[PDB]
From a paper:
To further elucidate the molecular mechanisms of aminoglycoside-specific RND efflux pumps, here, we report the cryo-electron microscopy (cryo-EM) structure of the [name] [name] aminoglycoside efflux pump to a resolution of 3.63 Å. The cryo-EM structure of [name] reveals that this multidrug efflux pump forms a homotrimer and adopts the overall fold of hydrophobe-amphiphile efflux (HAE)-RND membrane proteins. Similar to the assembly of many other HAE-RND pumps, the cryo-EM structure of [name] displays an asymmetric, homotrimeric architecture with the pseudo-threefold axis positioned perpendicular to the membrane surface. The conformational states of the three [name] protomers assembled to form this trimer can be assigned as “binding,” “resting,” and “extrusion” states, where the periplasmic cleft established between PC1 and PC2 of the "binding” conformer is open, but the periplasmic clefts in both the "extrusion" and "resting" conformers of this pump are closed. The [name] pump constitutes a large, spacious substrate-binding cavity deep inside the periplasmic cleft. This cavity, compartmentalized into the proximal and distal drug-binding sites, is surrounded with several anionic residues, such as E129, D133, and E175, and aromatic residues, including Y127, Y613, and Y659. Based on the structural information, these anionic and aromatic residues may be critically important for substrate recognition, where [name] may prefer to bind positively charged drugs. Within the “extrusion” protomer of [name], the cryo-EM structure indicates a similar tunnel, where it vertically connects the opening situated at the ceiling of the central cavity up to the exit site located at the bottom of the funnel region of the [name] trimer. Like the extrusion tunnel of AcrD, this [name] extrusion tunnel is surrounded with charged residues such as D100, E129, K130, D133, R166, E169, K173, and E175. In addition to the extrusion tunnel, we noticed a formation of a horizontal tunnel at the “binding” protomer of [name]. This binding tunnel allows for the interior of the periplasmic domain of the “binding” protomer to be exposed to solvent via the entrance site of the periplasmic cleft created between subdomains PC1 and PC2.
Residue numbers in the entry:
A (entry chain C): 1 to 215, 231 to 251, 257 to 1031
B (entry chain A): 1 to 1031
Amino acid sequence: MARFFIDRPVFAWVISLLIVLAGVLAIRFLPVAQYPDIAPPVVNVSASYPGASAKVVEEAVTAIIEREMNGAPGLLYTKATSSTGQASLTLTFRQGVNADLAAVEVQNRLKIVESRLPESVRRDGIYVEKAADSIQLIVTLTSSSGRYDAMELGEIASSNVLQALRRVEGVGKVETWGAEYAMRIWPDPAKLTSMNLSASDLVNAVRRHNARLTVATVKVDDTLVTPEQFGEIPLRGAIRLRDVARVEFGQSEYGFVSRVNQMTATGLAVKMAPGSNAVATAKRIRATLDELSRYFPEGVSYNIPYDTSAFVEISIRKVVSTLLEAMLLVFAVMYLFMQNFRATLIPTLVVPVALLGTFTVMLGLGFSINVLTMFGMVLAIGILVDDAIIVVENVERLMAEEGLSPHDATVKAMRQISGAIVGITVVLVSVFVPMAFFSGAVGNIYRQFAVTLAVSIGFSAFLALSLTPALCATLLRPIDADHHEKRGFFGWFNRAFLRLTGRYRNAVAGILARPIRWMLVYALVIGVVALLFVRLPQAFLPEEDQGDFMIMVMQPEGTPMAETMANVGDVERYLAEHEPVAYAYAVGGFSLYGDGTSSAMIFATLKDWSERREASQHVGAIVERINQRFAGLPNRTVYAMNSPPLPDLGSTSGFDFRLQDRGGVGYEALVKARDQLLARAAEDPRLANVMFAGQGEAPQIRLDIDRRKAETLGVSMDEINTTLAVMFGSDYIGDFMHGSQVRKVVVQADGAKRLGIDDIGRLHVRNEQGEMVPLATFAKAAWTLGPPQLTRYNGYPSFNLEGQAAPGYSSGEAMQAMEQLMQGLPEGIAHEWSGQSFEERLSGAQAPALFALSVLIVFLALAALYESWSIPLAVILVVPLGVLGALLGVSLRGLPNDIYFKVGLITIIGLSAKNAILIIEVAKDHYQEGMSLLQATLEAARLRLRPIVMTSLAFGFGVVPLALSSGAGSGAQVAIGTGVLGGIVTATVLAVFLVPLFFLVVGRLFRLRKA
Amino acid sequence: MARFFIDRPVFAWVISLLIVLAGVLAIRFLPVAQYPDIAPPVVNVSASYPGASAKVVEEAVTAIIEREMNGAPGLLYTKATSSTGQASLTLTFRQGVNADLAAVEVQNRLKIVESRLPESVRRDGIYVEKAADSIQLIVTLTSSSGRYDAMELGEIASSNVLQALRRVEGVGKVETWGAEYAMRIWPDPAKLTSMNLSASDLVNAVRRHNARLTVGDIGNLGVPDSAPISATVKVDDTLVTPEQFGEIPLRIRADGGAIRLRDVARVEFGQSEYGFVSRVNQMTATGLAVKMAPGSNAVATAKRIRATLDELSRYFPEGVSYNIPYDTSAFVEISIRKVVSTLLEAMLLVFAVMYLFMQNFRATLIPTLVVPVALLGTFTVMLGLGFSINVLTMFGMVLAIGILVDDAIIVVENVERLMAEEGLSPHDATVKAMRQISGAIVGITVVLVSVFVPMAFFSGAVGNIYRQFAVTLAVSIGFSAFLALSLTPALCATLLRPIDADHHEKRGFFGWFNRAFLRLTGRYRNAVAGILARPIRWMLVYALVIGVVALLFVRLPQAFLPEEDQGDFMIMVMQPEGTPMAETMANVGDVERYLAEHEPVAYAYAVGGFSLYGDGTSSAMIFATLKDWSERREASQHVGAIVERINQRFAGLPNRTVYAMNSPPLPDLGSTSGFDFRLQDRGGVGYEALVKARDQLLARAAEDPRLANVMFAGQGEAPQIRLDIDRRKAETLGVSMDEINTTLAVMFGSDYIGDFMHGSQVRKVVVQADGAKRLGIDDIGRLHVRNEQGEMVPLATFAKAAWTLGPPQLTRYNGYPSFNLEGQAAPGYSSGEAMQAMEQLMQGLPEGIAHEWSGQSFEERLSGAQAPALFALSVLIVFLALAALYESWSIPLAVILVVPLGVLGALLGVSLRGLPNDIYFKVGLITIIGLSAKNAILIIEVAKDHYQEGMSLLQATLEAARLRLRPIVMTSLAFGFGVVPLALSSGAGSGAQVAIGTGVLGGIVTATVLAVFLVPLFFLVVGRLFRLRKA
């Protein structure tokens, strides 16, 4: 199609302009994130059973819900945890299903068995949510004036900040943590002993008293549901202000302890709406917070102690800068060689248009701009530059070597290269597309953009076959005699390169003269590539310094909120002393529990990477100082999540072993079996570190209820629960503490401070008649060592076991070994692989199959291009040369065989394949002219030397910055750099000295002949 | 293309290899199903109202829910089954509606009307499952020996098998036909009355104790104050043992609450399901039904079910083995396999014919290479379009083979002509021949595709079926055309060697064949000249042929799809309602022993308490899987004869009426093998009047010869206690709440206090009154409803026994009371004829009684309407395409005139073997019309060329026929041989192949014999009448 566009420059210009406009609009509309969503759709079901035993919770809430959920469409697996007071059922759904529809179905299935569940949970209501536990940005309002209560600050936030943030563009939810104003019934612990508490009766009286008219403008506007109104409501001396309530309550609604750098604030979490540019949304939030800060009564200073958007923005900046600098370097190299400003301008114009077309296609398919997208964009710009530069170089050499006018030179050059261009486009497509077939969306994105960037070279089949030929036909002007080659650096460089080309041709002739030796050298290259590939660790994503670290203080099942705050303060002080933390906002609860008193979350934002340049000031080293040194206390399990990777799914050899099947075996029996299995796994060499992730059994106490005696007596079982409520009892609620606002009322013995332990099996219980009779007479409290949380997998109480494969042992091999080690365990116990293990069990041989398919397709396409069944074999043989350099560089650097490295290796393969195809095509053309194989090969090597050198130099120098990255996203950049740079260097040199040898060998072997 | 691919053989080979690889991958990814997916989205809303009769359930649950759902988007039709104690609502939505979204809408409407439903119904829960109503798979846990009893096997299945079966993808509903091992309590109404204790109060106390006890939130979390010990007191009073359930306290007297459950009830950890008795091959085993969700492939789902069962067996307790006694998809798999083998045989036969004619291995080889490439490309296109690997698509490929070879045959023959006559090099000969024949190839392909174009425009499920076949065939033909323009030219340019020096007609049998064909050609030339001598006579003969075609097509009966030997059937053993389960299973065992003794039955699963007609103690069904078709190759051992023998063996048994049916064809469309008829009652004529109309219609069906085995699916009325509760009395007495009435009714039925933790899972707690006491005639009268004030107010105050004959269940089809009248087509009468006979007899029934067809019958009526118009449109399109091809408005008329001969052949073929006008027949008719038109083109084009050259019209026709005898015979013979295995198929899937092959074979046979003697006549007559100009 080149001839058409060469004749119609305005046509090609129009096509390019359309592409550019589409790209601009696509960038305007494209979603932006750090990483694309890869996690399978997951539905979280949460329920709260106030004051319920973990075993009780498992028996009623967990089991029924889990059993009913079985049958939902595409329910890949079900995991359930039964803690005390609450239960969580994570339902992992197979990929391809819409999370929203799955959530609706889950809600309906919950409705099916709503009645069976206990009434208290029914009041609380089962909460179903699509798994989106991504708090991207956090806003906190500290007491700037030092005169604002935590609940007061929270009131200011909810009144103003809450709604405005909800209205802000791209905000999924703005859930809050700040403490509120709820009442807390605070009776003495002798209330039952002196007269009676019977708080159930008076709370029921509270609910009954609060009433509204049922019939129409007439209504009642009288309702007393407040601490002050509790002296006016009948609270059943007895309990009231008029009766004896005395100690009312305190701390309002005690909640998440929010301290921004040891300064009280209000917890206001924010999550980005899925599909919205995080950076731009952050900007919106910032402006809105400025306005609201001006609103604030000069005590509500807004602080951002956490914003993931910053790292996303800086990484995108790094990539975009890399693109711009690469274009600049391409300009530099093309000026160095061509020495014609217009010729320099041509590819500098062509390349961005193809990039914009890639952007358009990306928006069309729905792929979102992410660090993977942009990082691979930097991979294919070199390939983008390569095709434009080879086209324009072929055009200009004809203008120089011959006297063809720009139009004629363009026509002849396109006649020479066009078919090769088509073939190369097809080959690159067939080498990049197979990456999509992987069940990893990482590879899918790294495909889609790279595929449409080789089809940006296909847009170049509408540009480098349409626009670039047109531009060369018009922008290029005939060489000004030899004025382009003066006595300056440019001219000397040109002459020197001519001398170098002569030397190179002589060396290539020498190599061809003794083919056997150099083919043996190539076989040695194969061996070296193999051995380097073997001695290389495997990884999925290189972690980087996000600029923030998360700490969780796990403490014994329940610790006094004062004690938890003490430990939090200790951690915060340690961070403020020996760590470079810009903001160290601390929030109680949260962590794994979500509101657990023992649990505590520390969101600590590091300083700028510039001041933390020292390796000891890297997030890895900073987290290393935490979790030990200061941390590591026996009871105080303070662990810092070391920059949790945004795709929290990468696992090299993690084994999600689940001893799910109970088959009736007691919990004790399952514990025994778990111990035996983990010991044997440790013994077996195929297996590596094996742990029981479940928390070890903690000390506890049980109370065998005197239910039989309560049958004999007037004491009801609910009366026994009420007596517990008197002494060890809470979590009920009230309503309308402040107007329409619904708050809670909680009974607490001896006001706030009960200070009682011997209350266990000691308190008396007045019967239905009212006679004081200790339930301890027949009910007994006994010390125990029960488990903290009960985990059930797929409807079977399970012991989640996490293990890795031993060094050098295959992950699947180790999984088979795990199964065999289990084999022989007591009957009723079985295994069920989950997560990475489950997916691997489903299919793990996709990679070799699609690689072989890609090789076959490439061979067939090359056979079509060369019109022979033998010539492509050389192009196939070219491949390992590029791999050699990537392996060498990654080995010297010490970086692992990460996804970045693999994709860069594929890109290097593509570049070297393009160069080889060009070389061999030109050599074949010369041979078909009549020139002997040797001489034709030498001529092709001479001709296809300068474009290859220019391509390699430009791309390598563009990649060098990434290979020398300094923090702020350094990991991924250096992986990509190292890989691509090594591949480029070795690929280029070995190619220009071996591909002629390959063609010569094939020609001699298969007796290639003229047409 | 032609010259391009000729000059670059490597490129052509590369393209073909790419197509082959794509086909291989597509086959690897293509789904497999017997018939193209035609299942409409269906959602079954099931509810239970224990202690309520069919009338009570109808008026309290089914009516309200049906009214609410009425008006939903899509919702093609609504089927309501108000059984006694259970409500069923099958809502069938229109094809294409998102099943999940429809289910969501149903859930929303259920939410709307939930507040008006009985509270007990809410407690039981309304299960809205997007499932079908046909038991595709059965899983039976057989004990090795008496290690596990029925209850043990049922519990094991529920603990492990049930959840995993529900977990697999594609399953819609897993019915349980075993036991649940749930706490069974048996309160004595006599004892309760003697102690003046209401059963509801007992239920309340049991639920009270069953409820798990709780604690507070002080001493562990928040502010535990001085709690260094965890001291999170773990409630230890939950009751599991039946003794503990007995211990539950009841009304406490002055002496004490000595009255417990044990005093007035029998507590035992027995099974909860007493209404299902399952035996596999006369071996007691628990059973779990599996109904595939609509939209599932139902083969891969079966495979994954088998894999999951394998793993569970790996973890089964010693002595438990899973077994599948009834699988529908196995026939699908084996039939697809057989069709593939038939395709291979057809390829071999076509190769044989082409070698017999060309007599050169390479020239014969080229089309043989062409065939599979086109087939694989068609497979890839099918994958792109979503067409699954179906019997019709595979039929399309099998028919395609012979329609694909011909193009390559023509190309090769032209290349041979030029290479030999003009002494051209294979390259040059190929180039010139391709230059001359490319347009002809493209045109012929276009006409062929045109003939199939309208058949893709059918509507409905038959629309999908015809579309799949037609598109498959058309794509195959298009690929053949492309290959004949790309691959075949290259192969002829390179593979074809120059004609062997002095080719002495390949002396031998080939030489004899050539000489005999030359003599036959002379005789044929003389015959054609004789026909042309007196054109009027032979044209009159052709008009007579048209009349014969019309007569035959009128006589031919119309049907939907031929029945096949599925290899599995179902024996509905019906007993009078109320018949004890024990003797019902005894009769079922009699039937099973008869099966084992005489019939070739591999597996005979027998379940008592389940039937398509209804679920009851009398109801029973035997899912029997036959032995392999190879062992049952004898006609007497085919499924039909077996079913007839079973029916006759247990005929004349009103005490135990036994009816055997074959597995319903197209199970997705309908669950009834015979045509399904709904006798709805639009007008308020009345239930009794509807009964009278039903009986009258059934008598008419019995006397009508065209109808057989026409009966009411629902069981007859049984004498039952018609306990009525006005519930206004409940208002006056102070109860003012049906909840206590509901508790008493479910005490008569099955009351559930709640659930208790058992072993690893949670089992149920049931309180059913003792069997003898429960069946007590005046137990309801003697019992007292607990008043709101606790008063033992006599339940008889608003209880009226009033024993009366009552229907066991009620059916409301499309919001109208209806009676399901299933019927079978009598021998010698097609399904369409049987349905029309049912309609004719329906005329004369009283007003307000409306006839209706559902399932396959509805689709059959829909298919019948649109059949002729699309065929006429096919004829029109073909005529216009030919007119374009010949660049005249006269010449195409002859090619159109050719069609009736092929139609005659198809009609004769089906008439001789008694095959009705089914879907396969119409498909074969379309294909035959196409190929006959192709041959007519082949002859007429040469005739036209000769005429315009200067040869006289008669001379032109004669010479064209002489030159075309060999190609026409070759192509027709290739196609015919390719279709031969279909007509001669025997085994699983034999019926479909026999139908289509018979039609196509007859058509092609006449579309050649009649063609070679009338197409020249047609050309001569047209040339004379329309004065064809020599231009």
